[PDB]
């Protein structure tokens, strides 16, 4: 029927667009000041890229991005949204008296029909770890409406990988799974399921934030150029990595974040979800290693992170990594659609052994 129906189980779509039908979710997204702030600047400050232009807003939700484009002088704006948020955004279009410049089209971008080609596509298709939700494919799919020389806002995406040490996080997994390791839970021996409990917990990417000093080597960046990439490029994403360790210790996994750049004619605006930057609602994503890997400063940690698209609008994660000086290796399989939200609001504590001067001296 449509490209979206082929690659997405109906049940996943239902749950998915039902989520985005709630104004409370839009609200949560709009109240991300970094997110909404950066998108606004990237649009109004590149006003020549919108002034009198034709615009496509893919997955517009409430239409906020389509108003920024209007605020930038766009002539006509086709705002596509599949969730039932489309009708709320039409209301906002009427109430803001923009029915002549912003056209809401209820429906999935892979199925709707636009009356013309656009000069620029705008969207917010980034999920956590960038690739979750598989909306980037819808963003690249939308290029069937983009004229030659048209632009994409965002234009590129940089996903960053880095190995981290966090013993507390790792040990937490066994502390929770060890619930099942008792011979008499109300007179039942649960121990036979302890191993399955561990496995289940390690399959979950961890969504929270952390102090930069848990990282043991500079980041490796894999870049998707939205102006050149095609849908099929994202069904299988292989991210080779060769980290040079700057800190000795136990590598418990790889940390993920991403950035996007709105490369306009006037300036390039960056939206970065890095642990060095103020927190956004994307947080950061860490993938643990079933078995951790000892590494010393000067060793090389090498391997691959392979993401395989599934019919649940997410990715199956496979991470293989070894310390080249020892041959010690570690594998892991995680489901990006079932993360464990760990954030607690507390500022991330610094890893131990990080004071190189007496804390008492300058207290």
């Amino acid at each position: 029927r449509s490209v979206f129906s082929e690659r997405t189980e109906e049940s996943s779509a239902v749950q998915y667009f039902q989520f985005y039908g709630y104004l409370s979710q839009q609200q949560n997204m709009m109240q991300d000041y970094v997110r909404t702030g950066t998108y606004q600047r990237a649009i109004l400050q590149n006003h020549t890229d919108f002034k009198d232009k034709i615009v496509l807003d893919v997955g517009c939700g409430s239409g906020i991005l389509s108003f920024f484009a209007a605020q930038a002088g766009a002539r006509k704006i086709y705002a596509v949204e599949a969730s039932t948020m489309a009708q709320h955004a039409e209301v906002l279009v009427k109430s803001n008296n923009l029915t002549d410049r912003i056209v809401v089209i209820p429906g999935k971008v892979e199925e709707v029909s636009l009356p013309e080609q656009v000069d620029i596509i705008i969207s917010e298709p980034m999920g956590y770890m960038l690739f979750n939700e598989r909306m980037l494919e819808s963003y690249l799919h939308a290029k069937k409406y983009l004229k030659p020389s048209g632009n994409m806002f965002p234009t590129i995406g940089d996903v960053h990988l880095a190995p981290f040490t966090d013993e507390q996080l790792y040990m937490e997994q066994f502390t929770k799974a060890n619930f099942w390791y008792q011979p008499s839970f109300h007179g039942v021996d649960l121990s036979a399921l302890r191993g399955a409990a561990v496995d289940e917990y390690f399959r979950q990417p961890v969504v929270d934030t952390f102090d930069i000093r848990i990282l043991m080597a500079k980041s490796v960046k894999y870049t998707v150029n939205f102006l050149e990439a095609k849908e099929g490029d994202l069904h299988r994403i292989e991210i080779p990595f060769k980290f040079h360790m700057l800190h000795s210790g136990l590598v418990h996994g790889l940390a993920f974040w991403f950035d996007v750049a709105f490369i306009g004619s006037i300036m390039t605006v960056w939206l970065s979800t890095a642990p060095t930057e103020p927190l956004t609602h994307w947080y950061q994503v860490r993938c643990l290693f079933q078995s951790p890997l000892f590494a010393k400063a000067g060793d090389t940690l090498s391997g691959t992170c392979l993401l395989i698209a599934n019919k649940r609008q997410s990715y199956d994660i496979s991470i293989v990594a070894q310390v080249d000086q020892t041959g010690s290796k570690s594998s892991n399989l995680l489901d990006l659609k079932n993360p464990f939200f760990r954030y607690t609001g507390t500022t991330p504590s610094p890893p131990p052994g990080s004071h190189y001067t007496s804390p008492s001296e300058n207290m």
């Binding site: 998915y16 989520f19 956590y128 979750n132 927190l279 609602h281």
Partner: peptide, 10 residues
């Protein structure tokens, strides 16, 4: 997933 976009505290 269940919550594609995570809640960010205001």
């Amino acid at each position: 997933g269940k919550a594609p976009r995570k809640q960010l505290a205001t």
